Structure 1
Amino acid sequence: DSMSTFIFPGDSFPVDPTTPVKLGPGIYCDPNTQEIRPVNTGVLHVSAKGKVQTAYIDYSSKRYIPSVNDFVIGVIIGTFSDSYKVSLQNFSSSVSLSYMAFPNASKKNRPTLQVGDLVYARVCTAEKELEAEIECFDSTTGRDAGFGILEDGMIIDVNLNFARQLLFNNDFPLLKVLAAHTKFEVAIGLNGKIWVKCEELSNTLACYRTIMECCQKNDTAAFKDIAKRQFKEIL
């Protein structure tokens, strides 16, 4: 339960059988045997309870797989009749972004996004049989939900764990040690993409360098130091 435990694919699942458990990433329900089996190597994670506990396996991954309610940063790679063709990651299957999927959008009023533009969006549909769909608005009300174009910044490739940790964990010091040196705008994409823009190009470059170096290092406490050495503006 509360104690997270390392686990390999094929290992025996150690949660309570009588207790109902909703299954997240890492845990696979075999279609033929109806057995609950782990399929990813990593840390097994069981949430407290509520109404049913979530069992999921946090595993090291670099390749993003679209799931609903995810905040992603894509790049427009194509224009269609009623949608944009978007790339969330190189070599991955593209994602659709409806023309209707914008605030104050009608058939007469179209969005002004071109090929090569950065878009910050929410994965609204991620069916296993269909192409994934993203959106740049509140699907309910139809108004702006903090989504849209990202202009003149710099993008940073990062592993999924780092990005998830960056968006959800508030005890993560990278944003804090960055704020200690300069003012910056940041967009966090669970697809492993981090967008950063400062007023000065120098500062944005510094942010880029320190974020990537922080990404390569497993130790969290080092960050501050790195940031220092990076904002000392060495070459």
Structure 2
Amino acid sequence: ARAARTVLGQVVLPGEELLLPESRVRVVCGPGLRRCGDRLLVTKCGRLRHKEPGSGSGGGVYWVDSQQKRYVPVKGDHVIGIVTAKSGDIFKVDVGGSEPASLSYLSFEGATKRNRPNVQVGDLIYGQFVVANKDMEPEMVCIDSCGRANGMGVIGQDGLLFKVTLGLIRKLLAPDCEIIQEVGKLHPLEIVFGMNGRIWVKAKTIQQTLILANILEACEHMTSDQRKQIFSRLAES
């Protein structure tokens, strides 16, 4: 109940109310926050964090960098999925949430009744949500709004799909990551990060793929010893 500015780098715990200064300037409540009157209730333990837009009118933005495993269908998030079945026109794909999301046979890039896509049960997908809400089952799509799949659609095959923590992704996709840069020097690869803690990787051989997946699922707290160890191993593959 004090000094939102003094705890922008501290560990907040649920229950805590924090209030912000002022006639006023619009702001936004992050994911791990909640609004109680004119105050901000915290709903999840986290190292609080703030940001401001390059302008001076936007006000600001607040959130908590909470680590966890379970995913919740959110809107405008790129997400991997696993087709669980098909009902007539629409086929239901799993995401890792409360319930399975839905696609449409004509959402993929360039499809109509006389041109259906090749999606088989068990096939994995990289889409994004357009209706993600607590009251309605989430529908996803594998096509930008303009009408082109800018990297979406079926993933492919000949790769390894594993699962990690969500904060790990939220960190790796950062433009100032060291591990995912250093890996671009030892051996090539191509990988999909899904904001649901689910990752897909491919390389030429398989030993490399396995070493890479182990690194990624461990890179949250790897020691320099193990770091250069696995780097040397990759260099010797």
Is the CA contact 1:4–1:43 (under 8 Å) kept in the aligned structure 2?
Answer: yes
Q: State the secondary structure of the residue aligned to 2:17.
A: coil
Which stretch of structure 1 is more off in the superposition, 68-77 or 203-212?
203-212
- Normalised by the size of structure 1, how large is the TM-score? 0.86
CA distance in 2, matches of 1:47, 1:125: 26
1:15 is the counterpart of 2:20: yes
Q: Which of 85, 97, 114 is the matching residue for 2:92? A: 85
Q: Name the Cα RMSD after superposition.
A: 2.4
Corresponding residue for residue 171 of structure 1 = 176
Cα offset for 1:100?
Answer: 1.9
Q: Does the C-alpha gap of structure 1 residues 196 and 86 become closer, same or farther in structure 2, counting only changes over 3 Å?
A: same
> Per-residue CA shift, 1:34-60, capped at 9, x if unaligned?
753111100211212443311111111
Indicate the SS of the match to 1:138. Answer: coil
- Select the residue among 121, 128, 134 that pairs with 2:127: 121
1:44-193 alignment, distance < 5 Å? 44-49=48-53, 50=55, 51-89=58-96, 92-139=98-145, 141-150=146-155, 151-167=157-173, 169-193=174-198
| 2:217 paired with 1:197 | no
**Structure 1 residues 191 and 222: CA distance shift in structure 2, 3 A:** farther
> How far apart, in 1, do the equivalents of 2:72 and 2:210 lie?
29
Q: Is the 8 A contact 1:76 1:84 kept in 2?
A: yes
My pick for the range that moved more, 46-55 or 192-201, is: 46-55
Assess, with a 3 A threshold, how the Cα gap between structure 1 residues 92 and 226 changes in structure 2: closer, same or farther: farther
Local SS of the residue matching 1:179: helix
CA distance in 2, matches of 1:164, 1:35: 27
Give the Cα separation in 1 of the matches to 2:130 and 2:218: 32
Could you tell me whether the CA contact under 8 Å between 1:213 and 1:226 is conserved in 2?
no
Give the aligned partner of residue 228 of structure 1. Answer: 231
Alpha-carbon shift at residue 113 of structure 1 (Å): 0.8
3-state DSSP of counterpart to 2:177: coil
- Local SS of the residue matching 1:98: coil
What's the counterpart of residue 208 of structure 1? 213
Q: Aligned AA for 2:43? A: V
What stretches of structure 2 of length at least 5 have no aligned partner?
A: none
How far does residue 4 in structure 1 lie from its aligned partner after superposition? 2.7
2:85–2:92: 8 Å Cα contact kept in structure 1?
yes
Matching residue's letter, 1:201: I
Q: Secondary structure at the match of 2:15?
A: coil
> Deviating runs (4+, > 6 A) in structure 1?
none
* C-alpha contact (below 8 Å) 2:18/2:39 kept by paired residues: no
**How far did residue 223 of structure 1 move?**
7.2
Separation of aligned partners in 2, 1:48 and 1:112: 44
Instruction: Give the aligned length.
Output: 227
1:25 lines up with 2:28 in the alignment: no
Q: Which moved more, 1:14-23 or 1:53-62?
A: 14-23
Query: Matches of 1:226 and 1:185 in 2, distance apart?
Result: 22
